[PDB]
């Protein structure tokens, strides 16, 4: 076991209809992770949407995206706003008109350049993915007083299993998972979906994504990953992991360097 949780009751090893009614704070709404999801919300009938990326109006694909969701749903809004600052997120909610309450904060933004342990340091990890952690923390602390029907934190497989080149992208996703793990314990629903390689995004679709494509996790189509998010809100799953991993190639790409009892619970992981 590489993952141990000693408790008073023993030793534990880690082992592998919701409607968009209200406004949707799609953090990083321009970036595919929250862009294909923003389109899904609009199709599902989102009365309002709020794609908020520092880029925002200045994003390569902003106007195109906005037009798509404006046709599918209604009242879609892109906004150039920081997510790291607590007060800029308070200003976001101040700008949110009282006309529509917020119930669907879909935090999707995540910055990433490299994830190699050789240079990974506190400064690096933080500056690498501070939009993902400080952003989610601010949204949590602000919405503690909001009746959100959904607070889906968009995370990845980097905190689900190991991923070279995402070791700096992994902590942020792990903080996301922990935030939702305590949020089901309190009175505010949160869903930490560990998204595998998104088919179309570029937020984590980088050199590691194309490597893992040929040894395990393969591109999960949006036209079924959006239904996976629907069912993760139909079951109110606190922390789901949506991946299209093929264990035929994954066994010799994970347990090869380190046998891991993590995957000795999935039945078709033997091969």
Nearest one of 89, 160, 194, 193 to 131, comparing CA atoms: 89
Name 32's Cβ contacts closer than 8 Å, sequence gap at least 6: 198, 200, 201, 202, 203, 205
- What whole-number distance in Å separates Cα of residue 28 and Cα of residue 106? 9
Q: Report strand pairing: 192-195 vs 241-242.
A: parallel
- What whole-number distance in Å separates Cα of residue 25 and Cα of residue 195? 19
Alpha helices in 197-264 (DSSP H): 207-213, 222-234, 247-254
What is the SS3 assignment for 37?
helix
- What whole-number distance in Å separates Cα of residue 101 and Cα of residue 124? 37
- What whole-number distance in Å separates Cα of residue 194 and Cα of residue 231? 14
Nearest one of 150, 180, 197 to 240, comparing CA atoms: 180
Q: Encode burial over 195-219: b for 16+ CB neighbours within 10 A, e otherwise.
A: bbbbbebebbbbebbeebeebbbbb
Q: Encode burial over 109-142: b for 16+ CB neighbours within 10 A, e otherwise.
A: bbbbebbeeeebeeeebeebbebbbbbbebbbeb
Nearest one of 201, 250, 206, 235 to 17, comparing CA atoms: 235
* Experimental approach: cryo-EM
**Are the CB atoms for 83 and 111 separated by under 8 Å?**
no
Strand partners, 245: 217
Taking CA atoms, 69 is separated from 23, 66, 103, 107, 239, in Å, by: 13, 5, 18, 18, 27
Helices and strands (H and E) in the chain: how many? 9, 11
How many CA atoms, within 13 angstroms, populate the side-chain half-sphere of residue 27? 29
- What whole-number distance in Å separates Cα of residue 31 and Cα of residue 46? 19
Nearest one of 32, 30, 67, 71 to 50, comparing CA atoms: 30
């Amino acid at each position: 076991e590489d993952q141990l949780a000693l408790r008073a009751d023993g030793v534990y090893g880690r082992r592998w209809e919701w409607k968009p009614t209200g406004t949707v704070l799609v953090t990083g709404g321009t970036g595919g992770v929250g862009g294909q999801i923003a389109r899904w919300l609009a199709r599902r009938g989102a009365p309002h949407l709020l794609l908020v990326s520092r880029s925002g109006p200045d994003a390569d694909g902003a106007g195109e995206l906005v037009a798509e969701l404006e046709a599918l749903g209604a009242r879609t809004t892109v906004a150039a706003c920081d997510v790291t600052d607590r007060e800029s997120v308070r200003e976001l909610l101040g700008g949110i008109g009282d006309d529509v309450p917020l119930s669907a904060v879909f935090h999707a933004a995540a910055t990433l350049d490299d994830g190699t342990v050789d240079t990974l340091t506190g400064e690096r990890i933080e500056r690498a993915s501070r939009a993902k952690v400080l952003g989610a923390r601010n949204l949590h602390e602000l919405t503690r007083e909001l009746d959100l029907t959904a607070f889906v934190l968009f995370s990845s497989f980097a905190s689900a299993f190991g991923a070279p080149g995402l070791g700096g992208y992994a902590p942020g996703n792990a903080y996301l998972d922990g935030l939702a793990q305590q949020r089901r314990s309190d009175g505010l629903p949160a869903t930490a979906v560990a998204w595998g390689t998104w088919a179309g995004s570029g937020m984590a679709e980088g050199p590691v994504a194309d490597r893992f494509r040929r040894h395990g996790v393969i591109e999960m189509p949006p036209e079924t990953a959006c239904r996976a998010l629907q069912n993760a809100l139909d079951r109110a799953e606190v922390c789901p992991i949506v991946i299209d991993v093929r264990w035929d190639r994954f066994l010799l790409a994970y347990t090869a360097q380190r046998p891991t009892r993590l995957f000795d619970e999935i039945d078709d992981a033997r091969r």
